[PDB]
Nucleic acid binder design. Structure first.
Lengths: 101, 101
RNA sequence: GAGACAUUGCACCCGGAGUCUC
RNA sequence: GAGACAUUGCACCCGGAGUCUC
């Protein structure tokens, strides 16, 4: 009982604000998760599972681990955003090996 | 007048068959473009611009140049498929730099 | 088609992109 | 909604994914 998130490639924030215009979350999420690293991409939808969250992509665990240990429960526009690692992280990293490496 | 395709990252076949079930093109396209290299992905739709073609992705020009100089106008199921380089190639290669390289 | 109310959630999946007609 | 007929074409873009109602 009681599972665990654990660090895995990147992370995903949750409990986001419920009064943002979606694009406002990218300007804030894609502006704070890159200052101390380099954001590769973010995932924000309007489905039940994607309600009040936004998966962020970095490149290595040590990059997202540094971004997750900086805004741990931080106030965005009017609520504390909780950060949680992404056990699945960017699914393109499963075939990205063909990038050039 | 008279432009040129030129080699660029990967390629795209055209004049494909007009009696395939779509999945049959992937079994043939994704089976011959990998034997002499390593296919990264293929693009086949049903739009006017995507009529009788299938963009293939490799990794480097020398990989697609080798695949394009092997099946130049080859018969698939009942027609000669013409191969043409993809000046745009996979658009993810524009931000894939964050893969790990 | 759209809006309000719900959920505290590991998503990057999926479907369309040429006209014509029943 | 689907099928036939068209186009010989550098696409990987885009839109949905919680219910309730007008």
């Amino acid at each position: 009982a009681v599972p665990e998130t654990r660090p895995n490639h990147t992370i995903y924030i949750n409990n986001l604000n419920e009064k943002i215009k979606k694009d406002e979350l990218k300007k804030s999420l894609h502006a704070i998760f890159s200052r101390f690293g380099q954001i590769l991409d973010i995932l924000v939808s309007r489905s039940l599972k994607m309600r009040g969250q936004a998966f962020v992509i970095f490149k290595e665990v040590s990059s997202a681990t540094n971004a997750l240990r900086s805004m741990q429960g931080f106030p965005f526009y009017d609520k504390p955003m909780r950060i949680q690692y992404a056990k699945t992280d960017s699914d393109i990293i499963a075939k990205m090996k063909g990038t050039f490496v």
